[PDB]
Amino acid sequence: GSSGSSGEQAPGTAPCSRGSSWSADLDKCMDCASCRARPHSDFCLGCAAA
Known part of the structure; x- marks a missing residue:
């Protein structure tokens, strides 16, 4: 509705979906x-x- 794009640490454990890459510098997948x-x-x- 208003807020809900990331969710409950969705990409947390699971890796990055085809398209994004893990960024150690930002400890997150871009x-x-x-x-x-x-x-x-x-x-x-x-x-x-x-």
């Missing part, structure tokens, strides 16, 4: 939505081969 505008991401760069 979504591509950030890589698209910011390709200088380490969570997607250090994780991906290239």
Whole structure:
């Protein structure tokens, strides 16, 4: 309705869904939505081969 996007630590235990990458620096998984505008991401760069 108003608030309810994250939920009960949904992504807590479970890994990141196809699209997002784990970010040790931010101890959280970032979504591509950030890589698209910011390709200088380490969570997607250090994780991906290239």
